[model samples]
Each structure stands twice: as structure tokens, then as C-alpha cells.
Target: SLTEIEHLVQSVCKSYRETCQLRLEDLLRQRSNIFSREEVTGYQRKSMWEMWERCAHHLTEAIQYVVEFAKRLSGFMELCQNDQIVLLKAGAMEVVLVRMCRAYNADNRTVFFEGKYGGMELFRALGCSELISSIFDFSHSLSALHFSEDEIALYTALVLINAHRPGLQEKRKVEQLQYNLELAFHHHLHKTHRQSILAKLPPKGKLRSLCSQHVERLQIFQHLHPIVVQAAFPPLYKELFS
Candidate 1:
């Protein structure tokens, strides 16, 4: 009983530590004001709005990094036989979303609560149209394999959750997931022009083709018949899906 309790405690502690690390990173990245030090003269200045803008600008970079990290992790996971890879990839993706949510939250809080302009509104003002437009534009050159349906769904869910908006219903979530699979299949069969478009974008640019490709792929099938809903994961699908 002591050993069992010790194991449980360790598990809980590890989870808590990881989660706290993720949240702290997100908060610090999004609210840079907290990281600034006061001058010896005692001038304590804060630029919450500027901090928000920086976070928004950096978000494009963050998305790029997450996509690359996920792609590499997914490839390595594919080579492993253990089922734990699925959980590992899921957890990694969740952390990426947490960072994204914090960036969006900083923008929202500044605009609504702090009486400052937010990225969402600024993006619209800059002709980006929908909040998803920048993401779509960035994903243009990436391959379909890099932007799987499951990944897209995960990103979408995180975005919605971060924005404090209602997420896709379970039914819709499944449909979107399935639709992404079908699109990926099509991409495999007959390579899309969008993939080439994605390749043309600067590889080192803050915008990542992989993330853009994934989001764009999602937008392509945003409207479909009998919206796909979540379903039990098949063994084969589970191995190849993430």
C-alpha cells in the first residue's frame, strides 16, 4: 500500500509539474511585462498592450515551431511499437495549444478588459478577415501528411477553447476529423497545387507551411454533408493518424 501510494503521488506530481511549466511558459511569453525588471531609479513601467502585440506577432512563430516539433515527434512515434506514443503526441500537442491559448487570451483580455486593441480586431483591420485566415495563408506549402485531420482538429479545438468560444460539438468534431482524413488521402493520390504554394513561402519565415497547410486543409472541408463526429480509434488509424 505504501508503494502504491508513492507511485500514485509521483504520477500526480509529474503531471502537475508539466502542466505548471506549460502554463508558466505561456504566461511569461504572452505577458512580457511581467518579465521586465525595474530600473535602479525606481521607474516601474508596464506595456501590457505592447506585450499583447508581441505575443500575437510571436504566435505565428510559435505555430511554426509546434508544427515542426509535432512532425518530428510523429515520425519517431510511427517507428515505435508502444501505444504510449499516441498519448505522448497528444500531450505534446496539448502543450502547444496551451501556449496558443495564452497568446489569444492575452489579446482578448487587453482588448475587452484593459481597453486596448486586440490581435483579433487588429488582424481584421489589417485585411486578414477571419481569425483563421493567417493560419490558412501560412499552411499553403506544407504537405498533407504534415497537416493530418486529427492535428487540425486538435489545433481548432485549442483555438476555440482559448477564444472562450463554443468548441465543435462531438458530432461535428468527428466529421471534421473524417473529412481531414479523406482530404489527406486525396492529397496522397493527386498532389494538390496548394502544396506547391506552401513550398514557395520562406522556410524561415515566422509562418510555417506545415501549420498553414493544416489549417488550410481544415478550411477546405469546413462545410460537408453529415458532419463527421468522434468515433472509436481504430488500431491502424491510431498508429498512422497523429
Candidate 2:
């Protein structure tokens, strides 16, 4: 039974990797060159809000794909409904940050947001320096880790299925699952997942920290720009309040 689970974990990783890779490529390919030839040649000092809309698409894409990520995982549906929601709610922001690393440009610490390449300055107005700076730092650290596609896939899946989450009928089962997954993760990594021994355990703690930063940023956004929340993401708005 344990062996079967390890195999299934591998499948989960593969499925997730394929989905994220395809979605990012599709969402970002269209946004690679959002500025026109004229804009590129002659720059403009756009308003912060004006810049906000242009940069929102990447986040919107990130959120939408997370909904899909929860639905599409083969074993995710086997869990209880509340467990599933807990997984999604707790891990969505973390997953967004990790998966979006593909679109991150380490050279300049710029990320492909809203279908276009924009500097972190574009998102500065959100008052999400913790989140913004974390992304840059995480990207650099992740690059140093040199994680492969499979490891990332498994890692993401592992992050989503957090075992310590409260209110689970079968918490031990989940913990065991994560335990086996940790074994697989390290097995692959020590086989050279860590060319840089500087990094240690607790990827989740760091991911969760960034996730907290994301939530703090959003809370600030909702407070400062209630109208944008209503107009841009009514559903997300409702969840934020709810």
C-alpha cells in the first residue's frame, strides 16, 4: 500500500508539473511583449492605478489556475470536502508564489505579471513590500537550489497537502502520506537536489511566510481600494470579506 502511494505521489507531481507549465506558458506567452513598439521606444510615467490593471493579469491567472489545481489533482478529490477546502485555502497563495517562479526573471528580479514583464515597482503601490521582496528572494534562493521539474511538482503537491491542518478525519493518513513524500523528495534531492547545502528543511515555513505576506497585501488592497476589489474580482472580494 505504501509503495502504491509513492507511485501515486509521482503521478500527482507529474500531472501538476504539466498543468502549471502549460498554464504559465499560455498565460505568460501572450504577455511577454505587452508594451507596443511605441511604448518601448518612448516610456511613460503611468499612474499607479493605471499600472495596476496592466499588471493584474498574472495574479488573476495565478488564482484561476489554483482553482484548477485543486480540482484536477487525481487524489485530491478522494479527500473529504472540508479537507479539500482547507488544503486549497491554506496553500493557494503558497502555490501561486512557487509556480510563478517559472515566469520569474532572476537577472533583474522581475516577474511576468498580467501578461507583461514589469518591474517590482509596478506592484509597489499595493504596499506589499514583504510579499514583493519575498518573491525576489525566494526566486534567487530557488535558483540556487536548482530544483528540477519533478522535484518542484512533488514539492508543490506536498505543500498543498499539509498534514497539520486542523479538522481532518484522517489526519494520520495524511501525515503518513507526507512522511513518505518527504522521503521521496529527499531521496531525489540528495541524489543531488541540493547542490547548495545552505538550504535546509522547512520549505513550507518559508512558503507559508510568503503566503502570509500575500494575504497581508491583499487585506491592505481591500482596505485601500474597496472599489477595485468589487470591480476587478467580485468573487475574490466576497471571499475576502467572508
Candidate 3:
């Protein structure tokens, strides 16, 4: 029975993970946000606005991916519709922030954005250097772990299945589901890896900190560039981030 249970959990998470890979660069390229490296000039408001818009679009796409992943996860649809929305609203951004590691190039400390490598200077126009550095550091640490596809899927499932998210109509149901994922993740981590040092889950608070930083910066940018944001940012993005 235990073996079968684990098998189902693994099957569910792995199946969902395959459909969840949303790379920022790919999204940008599809939307014609691509640009030559030479085009990244000084930190002008125009350049900053452009970068923010691209990132906002990508973030919205990533959020949509997360929402789909959640709906597909085991037991998610069984929850009340309100609880489902509450969970996604509270946790989708955290998943996206952690999912960012997939597109990061830690060796050179660059991120794949707008169809190319983006260093700190390129993102400096966003006016939130500290938050960007924190994101890079988190991505680097996550990449250093070299998590397998299975591990990554389990980790992401855990992030989205949190029972602690406020306003859940069915807390016990969510808690039970989370417990199932926690058990599956623990078994997967130890079964495939022997080194005790490798047995580490990313610091939970780190994602919260980074996500909060993102929201704070986003609000500032929204107010600072009210006109463009109102016209350009996706309505779903404004709903989620606002």
C-alpha cells in the first residue's frame, strides 16, 4: 500500500512538472521582446519601463503555468473553488520565484531574459538592485544543489500545497494533502541520494522574503509609471501582483 501510494504521488507530480517549464527567454522571444545585446544601453526610464513590461509579461505567464500545475496536482480540484484560488493567490509567486533557477546561469551570474543573458547592470534600470541580487543568490544556491527532475517536481508541489496559506475553507484537507507530498518528497530525496549534506530543502522563508520584495518593488514601479502599467501590464498580472 505504501509503495503504491508513493508511486501515485510521483506519477502525479512528474506528469505535472513536464507541462510547467516556462522560461522567461522563450516567452519574451515569442512575444517579440527579443533584442540584441547592444541595445541594452544606459538606465533610462524608457529602458526600465521596457524591461519591467517584459518581466511582468513573463511573470504572468509563469503564474498561469503554476495555476495549471496546481489544478492538475493530486487532490487540488477536490478542494473548494474558493480554497483553490486562495492557495494559488498566496503561493503562485513563490513557485515562480523558485522556478526561476531553471533559467539562471550561475557560473556567469546571468539570467536568460529577453532571448539573451542579462547581468546585474542590464536589470539595474528596474531600480531594485538589492532584490535582483537576492534573487540571483537564491537561484545560485538552488542550482548548486543539482536537484533532479523528480526532486524539483516534489519541491514545487510542496511549495504550492502549503496548508498555512490564509483563508483556506478546508484546512484539514489541504493539510492532509501536504502531508502526503511531504512524505513523498522525503522518500524521493533519500532514496536517490546518499550524502547527508545533499539532504536540504531550500529555506522556506527565503522565498517569502524574495516574493515580498518583488511585490513591494512592483507597487513602487506601478505608482511611478502609472500610465504605462495601466495600459501595458496584463490584466491577470495586475490582479495577481496588485
Candidate 4:
């Protein structure tokens, strides 16, 4: 039973190592393209604030990628449903922001938003340079680690299986489940990387720093998005509401 979980964890780690695993930049890149060097174009105002009323529209869409990522885990849905949603809500952006490291275009000093790239001066103007620099620095550090897919998946799964999250009903059961998964991770590693690997786990403080501000992240972008929020709207609702 112990080794069985190990095998599965190892199996997914192997699979993700090869495949381009789910992440934010690819998902967010779907939006308006902003390059650091590229001009930040201001959209002409139409009617009302589109994104907020739509409740951070594209963010919800982008979060689906997380659902897809969570589904990759063997243990998510088994948790209570509300726990699932709460865990999902808490970690959704954390995943994006972490995986978003790759999206940093250090060569250009630009960070991608949806599709847009906000450059040095633009971020400076918006008072977002602190956020911009923080992720860029952190992302590059993660890149430098050169962690294999196995490690990435291992870390990802562990981070999400929190026993102490706010509203989980079966905290003990869930914590036990998480404990078992770590057992599987250790077994899979088989006494693998010590110092090198240890360094790679994002430190709590630094991670918390960036996380402190998902600060209603893309606050600027969502406010300006001209598209109506809903994707597959029903005919009646689309016409009446939109």
C-alpha cells in the first residue's frame, strides 16, 4: 500500500517531467499581449466597468487551468467538496504566481499580463514595480534551480494538501491523507537530493511576500478589459444582462 502510492507519485512525476505541466503564463498569455518594450495602449471607454461586475472575469477562466492541475492529483476530489473549493480558492493564484516564474521575460524586463507585457516604466507608473520585481526575481531563482518535473509535481501536491486551512470539515482525515502523500514522496525520492533540493523549495517568507499581493492582482488589467465577462453565455442571459 505504501509503495503503491509511491509508484503513482513517481509515475505522475515522470509524466509531468516530460509534458509541459499546467501553469499560469500559458493560461494568462491568452489575454491582451503586453510586452515591456511594447506600448501599453489605453482602451477607449465604452459603457461601464466590465471586469469587476463580471467578477474578475478572465481570472475565473484562468483558474480552470488550476482545476485541471488539481485533477492531475490522485487525492483531490476525495476531500470534502467545500474543502475542495476552499483549498482551490486559497491556492489558485499561488499556483499561478509560482508557475508564472517562467513567464518573466528577464531579457526584456517585462512581465506578461493576460497577453500584455507591462514594462519597467509602465509598472513604475502604476506603482507595481515592487510586485513586478519580486516575482521576476523569484521566478528566475526557480528557473536557476533546474528542478525536474518530479520535484515540481511533488512540491505542488504537498503545498495544496493543507490540514489547517480555514473551512475543511475533515481536517484530520485530510491531514492524514496529506501525510500519506508525503510518505509516497519520500519513497519516490528514495533518499534523493538533500542540500540542492532543499534550496529549491521556495522559502516561506519570500513566497508569503509575493502572495500578500495577488493584491487583487491584475486589478489594472481587469478594470480595463473591454470584453463582457461571460464566455458561453446563454442567449437570453447574454442579451438581457450584457
Candidate 5:
């Protein structure tokens, strides 16, 4: 009975202490400017002190909540087997991600830029302005992937799994596919403007140089394996490399 009591106290106290300590640290760091003024007014000083008092009261309440929650968790654990525990933990993680994404998207506002050389203008010059807008619109329309916790987690897992592939060849192939797509986009832009006077106005050396650098990066990946180059991506790989 004593051993069980000790374990319960340790579990509950440690969790409460750690969480409170981190929260207190963050609160102090955020309010460090409060004491920076040469002379604090009576009202300002009182408000600062009141904030700290409220934080202390909340910390005490949180510790009690953690203790009770830990006791309940201990009983719950006794009722669940290994697989059930794993499933519950995974579900909890998914819920946390969902809540976080929801909160993140809630405060996100559409940002636009204006003026001659603004971001939107530059995107339009590159012939990708509508493409960029469409990408955002598509993302917003996709219920499954748009700011969804489970989908985001699954997407992360897939990227992680691919990153850990045994052969570096797979990574190289992915890189080449990206490079080819960029080159094709560039060519499309050039061709679209080919009939305009601006097409012959500026020297294309800078553009050519940039394309060369991109190909060079892809070449580094191509050095890994021919099969990776051929099969890692679509037939667009052959067209671009050729």
C-alpha cells in the first residue's frame, strides 16, 4: 500500500511540477518588459502584481487537478490492456493535432501585397499568380486535408517514412522530378512571352544561369542511380534530362 501511494504521488507531483514550471517560465519571459520602465506608476505596478497573484492561484488549482486526474488515470490503466492503451494514446494525439490546427487556421488571414514589385505582381510576372491562388483555393476546398489533424499526421508520417528509405536513390529521384517540373514551368513562361517585344529586351543569361544551377542540383541526385532517375518519377524525367 505504501509503494502504491508513493508511485501515485510521484507521478502526479512530477507532472504537475513540470507543467507549472514551464508555464511559469513562459509567463515570466513574456512579461519581462513589465519591469523595464524607469519608474512604474501605482496602477501599472498593481496590475503587474495582480497578474502574478492570479498566476500563482491558477498554478495551485492546476496541481490539484493533476493529482485527481492521475488517480483516475491509474484506475483506467488497470482496466485497459496493451493494445487498448496504444489505441487510446494515438487517438489522444490525433485529437491534440486537430485542436492545434483548428486554432492555427482560425487566426490565419489572407495576406495580399500590392504595388509594382509586390509579391502578387512578381507571381503574375512569373505566370503563376492564378496558379498560386488556385493552390490555396484547392487547399481550402479539400475537407479531408485542409487543416485536419489526422490527415496532417498521416502526411507527416509518409514523408518521414520516405526520408528513411535504405537507398539514397529514391530521394534523388524525387529531387529530379521537382527540378523537371520547375524547368518545364520556366519554359512555358518563356514561350508564352516569345512573341512580345519584352522577350528580346533583356539578356537571358541570368535565366539560363539559374536553370543550369537547378539542373546541377538535380544532377547530384542523378549520380545516385539510373533506375532511380527513370522510375522514381514519371516519363517527364527522360524529357527533362534529355
Candidate 6:
């Protein structure tokens, strides 16, 4: 049964790798399809407003990817609709943040963004230097584990299947799902000879803290730039973040 669950997770992970592995170069190319500008190379050169909008737009798309991933996980869709919404509302961003490591480059200490290796200074446009740094640190920390794709998939699922999220009407059902995932994850580590990796995984509480910090920053950012807030926030993004 564990083997079958492993296959299911592996198949689900393989199909959605692209969303998590976005490259900076590709993101930029999508934006500037007809022109190449040498001046648009650094934080000083670009408008922070534009950068924020682009990143937020991509973030919304990535959040959708996270929801899709959850839906494909075993037993997630079987939950009551309200319970499913509650889990997603509380946990999607945490899973997205974890998945972000896939788009990070540990060697250069850069995150893929807007078609380039975006260093911290480049992200100052978003006006949340602290959160950006935290995300980078978290990414680097997770990357240090050298986890396989399968490990990541299982971990992502585990992150979403939290049993204690407030308003969970089907707590027992959710707990069972989490228990099965944890068992499979443990078995996987043993099989892969990575038994110690379990202890090293960042605690869920740490991610919750980071997610709340990110939300705080985003709210402040919106207040400062109401025009951007009104312009193009994806509906789902607005619903989740607002």
C-alpha cells in the first residue's frame, strides 16, 4: 500500500514540476517578447511597482498550481467542500513557499525571477526586504537537504494535510490522511537510507510564522500602493491574501 501511494505521489509530482521550477530568464522572456533592453538589468533600473506587480501575478498563478497539486493528492478531494477550502486557505501559501526552493539557486544564492538571478537588492522593489531574505534563507536551508523530487512531493502533501487547522469539520478524516502520508514518508526515508532527514525537516510552525509575516508585508504593501492593488490582482490571489 505504501508502494502504491508512493507511485501515486511520484506521478502527481512529475506532471506539475514546471510551475515550481520557473526560471528567471523564462519569466522575463514571457514579459518582453519583442524587445531586449540593456538598461533593465538591476533594482535601480526597474520600477518597483512593475516588479511587484509581476511577482504578485506569478505568485497568484503559483498558488493555483498549489491548489491543483492538493486536489490530485490522495483523499484530498474526498473531504467535505468546506473542509477542503479551510485547509487550502490556511496551508496553500506554506506549501507554495516550500515549493519555492525548486526555483532557487543555492550556488549563487539567488532566486529565479523575471528572467534572471534576482539577488536580494533586486527584490527590494517589493518593499519587504526582511521577508525576501527569510524566504531565501528558508530556500537555502531546504536545498541543503538535497531531497529527491519524491521526498519533496510527500513533504508538500504532508504540509497541506494539517489536522489542526481551525474550522476543520472533518478533523478525523484529515488526521487519517495526514497519518497515512507520514507513514509513507517515513517508509520512504528508510527505503532511501535517509532516515535522519525526518528530524531535519523544518517544523510546520516555522512555515506558519513565515506565511503570516508574508501576509503582513503584503497587506502593508497594498496600503502603500492602492493603485497596484486595484489593478490586476488575480481573483483567487485577492481572496486568499485579502
The TM-score, computed over Cα atoms with residue i paired to residue i, of candidate 4 is: 0.65
1-242 per-residue lDDT for model 1 (tens digits): 44543343333233333333244343435453321123211211324334334434343344334433333321223333332233323333333433333333332232211222233333332223453444433333222234433234333332222211123224343344334433433343244333433344234424333444434433343322122323232442344233
Q: Model 3 Cα displacement at 50 (Å)?
A: 1.4
Q: Write the per-residue lDDT of candidate 4 for residues 103-162, one digit (tens) a residue.
A: 555555555554565554443444456766776777777766664556666766666666
Error of 2 at 126 (Å): 3.7
Give the poorly placed runs of model 6, Cα more than 4 Å off: 2-4, 11-41, 223-242
Ranking by lDDT: 6, 3, 2, 4, 1, 5
201 in model 4: Cα distance from truth in Å?
2.1
Candidate 2 lDDT by residue in tens digits, 1-242: 75765676667666676567455445446554554545433323565455445445455566666656656655567777667666666777677777766666665566665445655665555545666777877876765555556666767777777788776777776676677666766666666646344254335378777778777766565465532322333433345554
| Candidate 3 segments whose C-alpha is farther than 4 A from its true place | 22-39, 42-46, 194-199, 224-242
Compute the lDDT of residue 205 as modeled in candidate 5. Answer: 40
Task: Please give the range of 10 consecutive residues that has the lowest summed lDDT in model 6.
Answer: 31-40
Give lDDT tens digits, candidate 3, residues 62-141.
77777777878888889987778778777888888877777666666666765656666677677778998888988888
> In candidate 2, what residue range of length 10 has the lowest lDDT sum?
226-235
Superior by lDDT: candidate 1 or candidate 4: 4
TM-scores of the candidates are: 0.26, 0.73, 0.81, 0.65, 0.20, 0.82
**Would you give me the overall lDDT of model 6?**
0.72
In candidate 2, stretches whose alpha carbon ends up further than 4 angstroms from where it belongs are 1-6, 21-44, 50-57, 125-127, 190-204, 226-241
Residue range with the least summed lDDT across 10 consecutive positions in model 5: 111-120
State the lDDT of candidate 6 residue by residue for 63-118, as single tens digits: 77788787777788899988888888888888888887766667767666655555
Off by over 4 Å in 1: 1-82, 88-91, 102-118, 121-242
User: How large an RMSD does model 6 have?
Assistant: 4.8
Highest-scoring model, lDDT: 6
Clash count list over all predictions: 11, 3, 0, 10, 0, 3
